[PDB]
């Protein structure tokens, strides 16, 4: 879908006693399972996408809250952006005492009707003003025949859920270990888009996974001036960009209210609230003072207008991988401007890969920025993993240093090791061989930070303290490697350290 | 600047290491000072960062009444700057220690993610380190294997990961260190894939034009028998036009 549309998601639990207070074991509880799910996807969505909408609803309860079509349904929460007080409302109903806390309020086991329940949720999504990209309902019921004993009750539901799917709201399901069996082919076969224990999907809602997830958006758009005249529009996209702990919002102590930092400039002698025109900019050199205006400290540092000028072609081997400037950015075509320029770009991509070549360009991302120099290395897609595109096809902008960047480094000379000293090393190295994958690690600080933030925010008894994956697991490095550190200590240097 | 440390492939075996930054995206030494338009004196302006509560200009005192918060969904939560330091992830040392090794194939071009590049060298006048590290990197020159390493410049600063990538020059062994992404620094998008060319046609005459462009506008010319081309535009030897 288009950029702005929120994900929006409504959670809809069976309040019926026959599941709600029920267990075959003692070790879980289907309502305590669903509520855990709702709290846990909801705490995922809080860290990861505060912009996307959640609601939660109980059907078949005995005391009601709805707009209309009231009987035996209670909207615990209408659609809203997610936060702490909502997670605190769900927390109240959890656990052995929780399954009594709920009973003092909304009441349990009464008759219900899916064609009314699906009506209610529909009205909910309608009532909200925002643009929605995905509209999804989640069923937390075990009741595999949903009391369609009256087939002329049940045909209402099936038609109404035809109407859900027809209006482009989706609906989705989880089965919840009903004693002895559950089978979708009896009923729910036509409500969703051979026999089950409990859903292999449901564990994915307990991943508790944390990052920002920020959708595909351009960094900027530019014109690749091949010369004085021929241009194509290309995008500039950010495939790799270091995340930061979110900017902290300064607060008033006594009320927790946000407060404005409200800075001014004031003359050291006098009451002049000096305006931006009152003051210049300056330097000191050679015991004299150089004076420039607030226009020209940024008229200096201009050279060009936003674009990409072509500078001719190179071998890919001469672009030496030791000197690297800043993270590489992707280039991909954009018919939003320069229509049909995709036809040129695609031929340019295809044929550079045959030539074993890069294009060299000069690059300005904005007006009032100096040109850097950038090699456009061409790119090719590994769809072989059943069209999981690990690599998009296009170009990489790889940046190149200038003289000033390549800092001087001290004198040293040696070519010291013998073939035995390499030969022992060639063993330890081959014993320590693993497979790195790009996603195999996580930031120890930024992951810890969210766990501290939750303890403070949901008022938890403890920080979760989940230990990081960057420390070497040194006992495994002792054992897999084995004792071979002694080959350095014996064969390579004296015993004095 | 010099930085002294201890390269550590396993719990018992440490070697002395002292790295230097090698590429840094360089910035000018002297900032633009701020000066009064008529007096031309660099201290006739004081920069009052004053504060407001919005209840008709109640002005706060930062030393008593302002406490940083973070933001958590639809609501704000107050920390204390002095309780973040009580709970913050603290590195146990000014570490450098290898996690393991794997092929050049595990580490594609694009992903490199650093502010700087280090050159990571045997400590001055340590002839035991000189033989040991020359062994280390000579044993990486031939396998196409690369190292993966936890790093940290100093105490309190963030822990760090990535690729310690070897190379060779006739006067010294190279092994640069560069940062690589954590799982949340990496963005995955399915860009609509271009080999489905039926609506964006690359026809025979278009291809047969481009076939001559990319040979014709070559900078590198084959005026050699070293198999190194003329290097007709040596952009890494040019001075930065910003400072000129």
């Amino acid at each position: 879908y288009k950029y702005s549309g929120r994900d929006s998601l409504i959670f809809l639990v069976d309040a019926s006693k026959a599941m709600f207070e029920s267990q075959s074991e003692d070790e879980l509880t289907p309502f305590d399972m669903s509520i855990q799910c709702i709290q846990s996807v909801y705490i995922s969505k809080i860290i990861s996408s505060d912009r996307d909408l959640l609601a939660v609803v109980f059907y078949g309860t005995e005391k009601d809250k709805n707009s209309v079509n009231f009987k035996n349904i209670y909207v615990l929460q209408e659609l809203d952006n997610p936060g702490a007080k909502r997670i605190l409302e769900l927390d109240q109903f959890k656990g052995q005492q929780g399954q009594k806390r709920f009973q003092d309020m909304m009441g349990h086991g009464s008759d219900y009707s899916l064609s009314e329940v699906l009506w209610v949720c529909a009205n909910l999504f309608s009532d909200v003003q925002f643009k929605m990209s995905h509209k999804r309902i989640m069923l937390f019921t075990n009741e595999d025949n949903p009391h369609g004993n009256d087939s002329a009750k049940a045909s209402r539901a099936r038609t109404k859920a035809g109407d859900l799917r027809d209006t482009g709201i989706f609906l989705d399901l989880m089965h919840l270990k009903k004693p002895g069996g559950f089978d979708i082919s009896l009923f729910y076969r036509d409500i969703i888009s051979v026999h089950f224990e409990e859903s292999s999907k449901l564990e994915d809602l307990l991943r508790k996974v944390r990052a920002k997830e920020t959708r595909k958006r351009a960094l900027s758009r530019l014109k690749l001036k091949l010369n004085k005249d021929i241009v194509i529009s290309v995008g500039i996209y950010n495939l790799v960009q270091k995340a930061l702990k979110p900017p902290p919002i300064k607060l008033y102590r006594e009320t927790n209210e946000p407060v404005k930092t409200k800075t001014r400039t004031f003359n050291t002698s006098t009451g002049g609230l000096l305006l931006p025109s009152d003051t210049k900019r300056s330097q000191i050199y050679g015991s004299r003072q150089i004076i420039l205006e607030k226009e020209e400290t940024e008229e200096l540092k201009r050279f060009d207008d936003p674009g990409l000028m072509l500078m001719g072609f190179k071998p890919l081997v001469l672009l030496k991988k030791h000197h690297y400037l800043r993270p590489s950015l992707f280039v991909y075509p954009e018919e939003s401007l320069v229509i049909g320029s995709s036809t040129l770009f695609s031929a340019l991509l295809i044929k550079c890969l045959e030539k074993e070549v890069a294009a060299l360009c000069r690059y300005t991302p904005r007006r009032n920025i100096p040109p850097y120099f950038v090699a456009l290395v061409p790119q090719e897609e590994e769809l072989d993993d059943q069209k999981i595109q690990v690599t998009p096809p296009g170009f990489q902008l790889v940046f190149l240093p200038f003289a000033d960047d390549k800092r001087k480094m001290p004198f040293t000379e040696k070519i010291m090791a013998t073939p035995e000293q390499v030969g022992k090393m060639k063993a330890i190295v081959e014993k320590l061989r693993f497979t790195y994958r790009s996603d195999s690690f996580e930031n120890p600080v930024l992951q810890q930070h969210f766990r501290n933030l939750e303890a403070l925010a949901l008022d938890l008894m403890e920080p979760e303290q989940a230990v990081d994956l960057t420390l070497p697991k040194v006992e495994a490095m002792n054992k897999r490697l084995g004792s071979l550190v002694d080959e350095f200590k014996e064969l390579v240097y004296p015993p004095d350290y | 600047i010099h930085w002294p440390c201890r390269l550590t492939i396993g719990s018992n075996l440490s070697i002395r290491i002292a790295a230097y930054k090698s590429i840094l995206q360089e910035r000018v030494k002297k900032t633009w000072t701020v000066v009064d338009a008529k007096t031309l004196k660099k201290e006739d302006i004081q920069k009052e960062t004053v504060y407001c509560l919005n209840d008709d200009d109640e002005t706060e005192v930062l030393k008593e009444d302002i406490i940083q918060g973070f933001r958590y969904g639809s609501d704000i939560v107050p920390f204390s700057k002095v309780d973040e330091e009580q709970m913050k992830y603290k590195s146990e040392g000014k570490c450098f220690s290898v996690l393991g090794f794997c092929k050049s194939s595990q580490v594609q071009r694009r992903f490199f993610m650093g502010n700087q590049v280090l050159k990571v060298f045997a400590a001055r006048d340590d002839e035991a380190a000189a033989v040991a590290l020359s062994s280390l990197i000579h044993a990486l020159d031939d396998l196409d294997m690369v190292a993966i390493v936890r790093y940290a410049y100093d105490k309190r600063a963030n822990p760090q990961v990535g690729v310690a990538f070897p190379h060779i020059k006739h006067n010294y062994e190279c092994l640069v260190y560069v940062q690589l992404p954590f799982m949340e620094d990496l963005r995955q998008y399915m860009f609509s894939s271009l080999k489905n060319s039926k609506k964006y046609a690359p026809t025979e005459a278009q291809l047969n034009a481009v076939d001559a462009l990319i040979d014709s506008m070559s900078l590198a010319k084959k005026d050699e028998k070293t198999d190194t081309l003329e290097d007709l535009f040596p952009t890494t030897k040019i001075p930065n036009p910003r400072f000129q």
Partner: peptide, 23 residues
């Protein structure tokens, strides 16, 4: 389609479970 797309956070590609060094 389903195979790579997360149920917690749709359209976005499924976050695999952190990994680390293990031989």
């Amino acid at each position: 389609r389903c195979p790579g797309e997360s149920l917690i956070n749709p359209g976005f590609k499924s976050k695999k479970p952190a990994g680390g060094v293990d031989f």
